[PDB]
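RETRY 2/3 - previous attempt timed out on the joint model. Re-submitting the same 442-residue input unchanged.
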Amino acid sequence: GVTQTPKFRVLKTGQSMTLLCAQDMNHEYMYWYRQDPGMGLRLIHYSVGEGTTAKGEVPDGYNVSRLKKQNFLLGLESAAPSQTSVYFCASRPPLTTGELFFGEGSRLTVLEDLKNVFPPEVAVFEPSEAEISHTQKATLVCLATGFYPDHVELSWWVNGKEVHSGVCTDPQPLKEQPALNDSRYALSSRLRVSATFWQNPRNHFRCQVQFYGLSENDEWTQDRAKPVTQIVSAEAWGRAD
Amino acid sequence: GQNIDQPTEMTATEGAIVQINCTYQTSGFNGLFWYQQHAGEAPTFLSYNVLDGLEEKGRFSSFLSRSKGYSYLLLKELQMKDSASYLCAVLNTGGFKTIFGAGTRLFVKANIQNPDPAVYQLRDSKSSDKSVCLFTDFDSQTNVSQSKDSDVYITDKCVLDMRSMDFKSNSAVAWSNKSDFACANAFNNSIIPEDTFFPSP
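RETRY 2/3 succeeded.
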């Protein structure tokens, strides 16, 4: 369908970048939207054809190019902290009604300082013996903490295979110190299984946190490890008890 | 004046009927749309209305009143999977642009069959304990409020649908830096039932 790249991105304030959007559906109408909290989707620019660019209603301060029918480029020429949002691209063929085909979304974070970028700390909390006896069920709690920015994907893996049944993850990561503009974030997830599954000490439980941070093109001269895109995991083995 | 959706929120129980109301004011109406947006995926098309009024389209109904600038999306036999944002949108100018409302976040509450609300203390897998409390198995009616203390973080209602045993459960997580903070005092700022199980040894 509609392909948009990057999917995650950290820019330093003043820096410039481009968002790419490719349609494999042969559509004439292309669109760039932004979406923040309190939202909703707000069109930045649009294009009706191969060589035409148009209107707001939030056009400052992005540029847009349409050179090919397939691609519609959003340029950030001077990145500002206000520009941190979720960008969404859309394609439409009319008159073919008229339904919008949305891209996967681009999450951008514009920071004054790149040293404020931190990957998460990961921890799994083992089920209570009391819950096991009271319900015959066992809840694992996973906590991802001290991370900046909010570019995180948490999955649970039991014995090397991704589990979906019994998992419940916060759709939104909490701000540890809310008044802070540069505040780190925390995220929680739960994995509930049967007591006898947890009791099997062969069963291996893992909470995987994929963090999206610094790019390969980011220069890092600091002594601390470069906060690059990485996976941080914490694991638990079944308890005989 | 443009686009007004329920905002930011609506909450309902899985068996229920929900009506998502929308009002719009535009110069040249080329039709109204509704999209479903799961956090934080791309919105997906749900309905397009240009004529008055009601249209069934399965489990989701869509009404239009051109005279009033009013639309509603009706969701019947509500499911857990319907927990998403619902966006009201209008097509204006001469096609060319779809303008969106702010969006309505719909939280579906799970109909708990046999509830036993309890606060369980989960110790850390590695070392130091760092202390987490879990308030689980409580009914839909129960509302988990944020703490009076800054140093204690609370993650509001979560439903774990264990497909295997045809079960789904409510939960909330509470953790705080080694003060010490306790499981008995974790959910003090919330409206929790009198029968809540409290184990500690």
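The two ends of chain B are 59 Å apart (CA to CA). Closing ticket.
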